[PDB]
Paper text:
Changes in the spike (S) glycoprotein in these variants are under scrutiny because the S protein has a central role in engaging the angiotensin-converting enzyme 2 (ACE2) receptor to mediate cellular entry and is a dominant target of neutralizing antibodies (nAbs) elicited by either vaccination or natural infection. The prefusion SARS-CoV-2 S trimer is composed of S1 and S2 subunits separated by a furin cleavage site. The RBD transitions between a “closed” (“down”) receptor-inaccessible conformation and an “open” (“up”) conformation that allows binding to the ACE2 receptor.
The B.1.1.7 variant emerged in the UK in September 2020 and spread worldwide, with reports of increased transmissibility, virulence, and mortality. B.1.1.7 spike affinity for ACE2 was improved over the D614G spike by a factor of ~5 as a result of the N501Y substitution. Multiple populations of the 3-RBD-down and RBD-up states were identified, with a higher proportion of RBD-up particles observed for the B.1.1.7 spike (~1.8:1 RBD-up/RBD-down) relative to the D614G spike (~0.8:1) and the mink-associated ΔFV spike (~1.3:1). We next sought to understand how variations that are distal from the RBD/NTD region influence the B.1.1.7 spike conformational distribution. These variations spanned multiple domains including SD1 [Ala570 → Asp (A570D)], SD2 [Pro681 → His (P681H)], HR1 [Ser982 → Ala (S982A)], CD [Asp1118 → His (D1118H)], and the linker between SD2 and fusion peptide [Thr716 → Ile (T716I)]. The A570D substitution resulted in an interprotomer H-bond with the Asn856 side chain, reinforcing the stacking of the SD1 loop against the HR1 helix of the adjacent protomer. The HR1 S982A substitution, on the other hand, resulted in the loss of an interprotomer H-bond between the Ser982 and Thr547 side chains. Thus, the S982A mutation appears to disable a latch that modulates the RBD up/down equilibrium, thereby increasing RBD up propensity.
Author numbering:
A (entry chain B): 27 to 66, 81 to 143, 164 to 172, 186 to 242, 263 to 300
B (entry chain A): 301 to 483, 485 to 620, 641 to 676, 690 to 745
C (entry chain B): 696 to 811, 813 to 827, 854 to 1140
D (entry chain A): 944 to 1091
E (entry chain C): 548 to 597
F (entry chain C): 944 to 992
Write the structure that this text describes.
Amino acid sequence: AYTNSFTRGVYYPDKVFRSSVLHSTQDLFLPFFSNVTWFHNPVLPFNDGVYFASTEKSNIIRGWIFGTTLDSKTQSLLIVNNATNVVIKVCEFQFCNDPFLGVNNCTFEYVSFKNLREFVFKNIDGYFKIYSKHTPINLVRDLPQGFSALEPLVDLPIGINITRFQTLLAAYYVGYLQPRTFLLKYNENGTITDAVDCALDPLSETK
Amino acid sequence: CTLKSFTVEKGIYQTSNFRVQPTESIVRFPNITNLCPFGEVFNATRFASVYAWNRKRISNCVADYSVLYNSASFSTFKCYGVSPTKLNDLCFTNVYADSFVIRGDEVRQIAPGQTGKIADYNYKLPDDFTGCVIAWNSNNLDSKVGGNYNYLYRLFRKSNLKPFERDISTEIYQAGSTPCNGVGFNCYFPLQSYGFQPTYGVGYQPYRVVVLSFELLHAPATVCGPKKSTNLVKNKCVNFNFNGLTGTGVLTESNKKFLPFQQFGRDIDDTTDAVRDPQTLEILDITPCSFGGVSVITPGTNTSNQVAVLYQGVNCTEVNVFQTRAGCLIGAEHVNNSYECDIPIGAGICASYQTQSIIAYTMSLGAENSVAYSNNSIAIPINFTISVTTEILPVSMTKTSVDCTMYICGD
Amino acid sequence: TMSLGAENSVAYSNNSIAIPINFTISVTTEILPVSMTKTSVDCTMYICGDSTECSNLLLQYGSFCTQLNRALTGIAVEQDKNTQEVFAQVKQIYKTPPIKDFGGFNFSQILPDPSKSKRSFIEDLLFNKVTKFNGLTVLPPLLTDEMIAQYTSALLAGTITSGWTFGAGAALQIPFAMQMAYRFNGIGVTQNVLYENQKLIANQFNSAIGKIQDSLSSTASALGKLQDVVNQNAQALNTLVKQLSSNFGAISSVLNDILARLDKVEAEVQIDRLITGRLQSLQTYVTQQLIRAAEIRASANLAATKMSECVLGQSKRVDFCGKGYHLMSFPQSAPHGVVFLHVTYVPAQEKNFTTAPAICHDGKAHFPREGVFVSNGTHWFVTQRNFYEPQIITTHNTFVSGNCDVVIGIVNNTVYDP
Amino acid sequence: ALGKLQDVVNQNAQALNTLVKQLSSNFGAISSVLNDILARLDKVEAEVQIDRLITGRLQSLQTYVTQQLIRAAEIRASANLAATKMSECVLGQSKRVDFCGKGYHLMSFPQSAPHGVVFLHVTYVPAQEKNFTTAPAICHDGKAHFPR
Amino acid sequence: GTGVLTESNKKFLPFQQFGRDIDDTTDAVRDPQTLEILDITPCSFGGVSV
Amino acid sequence: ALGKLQDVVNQNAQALNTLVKQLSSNFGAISSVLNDILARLDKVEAEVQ
Ligand SMILES: *[C@@H]1O[C@H](CO)[C@@H](O)[C@H](O)[C@H]1NC(C)=O
Ligand SMILES: *[C@@H]1O[C@H](CO)[C@@H](O)[C@H](O)[C@H]1NC(C)=O
Ligand SMILES: *[C@@H]1O[C@H](CO)[C@@H](O)[C@H](O)[C@H]1NC(C)=O
Ligand SMILES: *[C@@H]1O[C@H](CO)[C@@H](O)[C@H](O)[C@H]1NC(C)=O
Ligand SMILES: *[C@@H]1O[C@H](CO)[C@@H](O)[C@H](O)[C@H]1NC(C)=O
Ligand SMILES: *[C@@H]1O[C@H](CO)[C@@H](O)[C@H](O)[C@H]1NC(C)=O
Ligand SMILES: *[C@@H]1O[C@H](CO)[C@@H](O)[C@H](O)[C@H]1NC(C)=O
Ligand SMILES: *[C@@H]1O[C@H](CO)[C@@H](O)[C@H](O)[C@H]1NC(C)=O
Ligand SMILES: *[C@@H]1O[C@H](CO)[C@@H](O)[C@H](O)[C@H]1NC(C)=O
Ligand SMILES: *[C@@H]1O[C@H](CO)[C@@H](O)[C@H](O)[C@H]1NC(C)=O
Ligand SMILES: *[C@@H]1O[C@H](CO)[C@@H](O)[C@H](O)[C@H]1NC(C)=O
Ligand SMILES: *[C@@H]1O[C@H](CO)[C@@H](O)[C@H](O)[C@H]1NC(C)=O
Ligand SMILES: *[C@@H]1O[C@H](CO)[C@@H](O)[C@H](O)[C@H]1NC(C)=O
Ligand SMILES: *[C@@H]1O[C@H](CO)[C@@H](O)[C@H](O)[C@H]1NC(C)=O
């Protein structure tokens, strides 16, 4: 199954405050009106980066696995979130698609339908970034036509090679970032309020 | 001095830029106190083979680079995009220390934008490299009796390495139609060794290499030089340095609504408008100290040596004294009368030399008149005056021409 | 494919003339830019700013920063000259009487409102529709908008109370209806055509000023000629300031980062790439501002000529002071320019008549002294050519020249001898 | 009195004095004097020093020519205005307000000046006005009369 | 250099070896073997028109 | 008679011919041909030329 992303997946592109200005930026962004996949499970490719979103009510989704092999020979990144802690760990893990049946030469460790949770995963320069947003919505969870920007959670210097990922278990959406130029509307009190995807159509290229 | 003459005609002349100078100087570095683990690299037991170079990430420490660059031990200490003398004043988001051994002739290949066997098959630096390459002779350590074969390089590959690409693969290379087959004629095992012997000639002797790669982003620092922080000063004009962001301006308390991840702010022209203090959750607005043009208002020097001074756009609280909308005007007397404009100051103000001193006044547009209009009154001339008025028009310039070859190259 | 206009076969023949039965007073609007914003750039503060290291390198290039600052100063001082050439033409600040007995013509929308700057109602419509640390400075104009409004007020009060006379010497008063009768007489329409139609002519003028007020309140798109002078200067400055962020091949575009990272022998090599590129960036801007200032000077010289010839006079130059035969025009100020409200006579309801070059009386050819011979079916009359008023043919309305035999198209008719 | 003609002389002098002074600038070479560089250095290094002088002197001369092209168009506008004044004002009698001096124009006379022309504009200016009552028309035997 | 050389009446003080003018030009010189002051002038030049 | 119109046509042709002929100039580089510089020289030297 598939869905229209509308204008979802915009994020704050740098750690710089701006107000009452239009900023034009090139980065890995989810293209406007892009064709996102929908799911109940499987391992998926990661490409240049992932936009991910889910139905925040039943709280069944708890984390992710990222890597190449997902089972030995080389490291994989594991993320798990529960009521007391977010935990992030990097190891030569040998689990199947359910490390929570338990839970390996570890090299890094770190600790910290009514609602829509949105995430961006990106692996470039200073390696793995996470951005997110959590907001209330009307009961049809079909990626609403409004606008909001994802804010950085963490920025991890881990140096890992990622080509595939999988969810740890509700329904969820997946889309892929692309090298794209955006014009961002920072309105007042630091806040991004609108954007133009400059390559979407000739009118956006004119704007 | 501005006009390059001893005589000045009546007028208003631009002569200088006025500036407030900084009354104090500031350094503002993060709360960190432990020395960076450089000794874990420069005094390591051994480094890897150059095809398999070893990277350490350095963070969350003070880096006294003088401990490195003062030492006579280093047979090479080159920097790119920075000067080694200057590193103790800088701050970096991360530092990556890369380590390996190569022969003394090949150290030339460890530089930005090179081509060659080591540069393109073993360790490639980027074109816009910022960092330092540090190397020293290691024939006392890495060379051994009968030769040391623990040190290797890749001699053959399908394609050249990208900057900081790493490739430890042992797979057979193919130089012709011959399939690799785990072996042959025009097919090769791609890895080779120096075999370092303590009797080798100095170009074939081993050199240890450490490359330090520095990154400075739109981000916090985590490695800083040992330069001590000092007390913050506000509302004065100050010279400052926050995490290596050197500048000058008035620092104010400010109410910019920074989100928790934002480390500094920018104006509509990308100038840095505000910063977060690296020792407090305090947001400081950076405003430039007072500056602007200075214009001197003068009658002719044939008439008087008095002058008045206009500080353009400047406010008289922050430089007789009079606030025009053109700027603060000093040495000209304000007058409640109005006259024809003599020297034009701007926004309706003019100045003149009168009963004597320089005066400044609102200009008068002409004599006020009411025409005696009525629905049945005319007025008719009883007489006339034949008037002759001179009009002067320029028609031509001097017909200059220049031999551009003789102007430029002088025969 | 664009349309050039509707086709019109004109009904020409060797003996047909069309003459207008009636007229419309037309009030056309013309907008002209006169001056720019007086922006000036310090070449050393733009190229370097704070840095002594960059400043000492910039001295090796010699006169260029004095030559650029001299050129921008010449452009800035000329904007005050352009504004003096247009508005400061009146010798004395004339004022209207407190009693508005102008023969039924109503100037309330174009004279000052003293309750307010003391601008007119239309000058406030015109002022509403139009809308620091990099070495850039903006200087104020010499005349404030309140001083420009005092000049347009004096020019307008002189025009209404004294006709063209205030442009030729002292203002001599004349009743406004008698001034309008001489502006009619100046376009070849006889004076009685005003006095016999004075309430219609006054109502057509008052109505046409109401259409200007409504049009200027309705849309900003008319003032695009002034707004483009703001937009061209803004795009030039936005480009000049953006060019500070360019590397030009230096390690950074931030001069303080070069000075914080490198020692003199390396820093001076990187800084000279910024000096070279920033100097070329400023030389390009001053060159295009010198060429743009010459276009505004030409438009200020045109506006100064339109004020002398259209406002202080009555132009006979076709289409100089609006379409139709020019009666008079009125100046209204606008930000960076001037607006002329051109009052013109437009003939409105043509009728066809048979016509002849001359008539035969007692074997002699009579020609019309002023006007045209026209025939109303069976009868012959003489008329002024710009408004139908059929006079009887008489020995006073006509002059003789020789026999009937020479003229092509002459007609036999009686001449009355009073 | 002739400040317009003297201003055109002064601008051409300031432009040439600036062009000449720019021969004394280094532009980043080891000397501003082209004969020093060739008396001190061999071709391989002298070509580096000389190309800095070529680059700065060519930019100095392109700036002068561009400003003389812009200044000549301002003189051509004044010469086309002076040519129009001689036709309409000297060879005729102008009816254009302010074109040929203040007052109603009678005639004007040309006199030559260095790089310019002077027009002596002769005009009728009215004087000594007196009021009088006025009327648009007069009633005779019921007929309304207007002045010719 | 290249130029015409002539006598001059330039009043060089005892410490002055050469004179200058604003084109970066040496305008005059003291001869080192016989301390007279020489004017330097460009050899005659101009455009050619056909 | 029509020399004013032909002069305007000739000036625009001469300015374009001059603009295009300036592609053959070296400006101090080893060659005026952009591919030839990249064939002769390695990255850091070629980019200065
Ligand atoms: C693209 O979007 C349309 C409309 O939602 C959908 O039918 C189609 O299957 C999508 N195709 C792919 C390859 O995602
Ligand atoms: C899960 O919850 C337990 C509660 O005791 C806590 O110890 C742990 O840190 C949490 N996170 C993970 C990934 O186990
Ligand atoms: C990451 O791992 C995959 C495994 O198939 C490999 O193809 C790829 O070359 C690796 N990434 C990089 C940047 O080399
Ligand atoms: C931020 O700006 C928006 C503008 O709509 C306003 O609603 C909000 O109250 C502002 N926040 C603060 C802290 O003033
Ligand atoms: C920084 O260190 C000082 C003591 O040197 C301490 O009082 C202050 O709370 C620290 N601030 C932060 C943000 O760590
Ligand atoms: C000048 O500065 C003072 C102090 O801030 C202020 O009261 C005054 O209004 C200012 N005047 C102008 C014209 O800037
Ligand atoms: C007109 O003026 C002249 C001087 O210009 C004078 O001699 C003459 O008497 C005046 N005539 C009248 C009627 O005022
Ligand atoms: C002339 O036009 C006016 C309106 O402009 C109209 O009221 C009047 O009746 C017309 N007169 C004739 C003779 O057509
Ligand atoms: C003049 O016109 C205005 C606007 O229509 C009107 O309010 C005013 O009463 C008129 N004045 C006279 C004297 O008719
Ligand atoms: C004048 O005559 C022509 C030809 O008869 C006719 O087409 C036109 O409509 C007439 N115009 C008027 C105003 O009567
Ligand atoms: C004008 O012509 C009509 C016929 O078209 C005629 O009835 C009328 O009498 C003529 N006018 C005069 C004043 O005779
Ligand atoms: C005009 O009158 C003359 C003399 O009576 C006569 O010869 C001629 O034929 C007449 N022409 C017309 C058109 O009536
Ligand atoms: C005309 O009348 C007015 C008002 O009575 C008066 O001011 C003026 O002096 C009179 N004389 C002249 C020559 O204007
Ligand atoms: C040589 O040079 C000196 C310079 O002072 C001069 O006095 C002398 O006459 C010259 N000739 C000889 C033969 O010394």
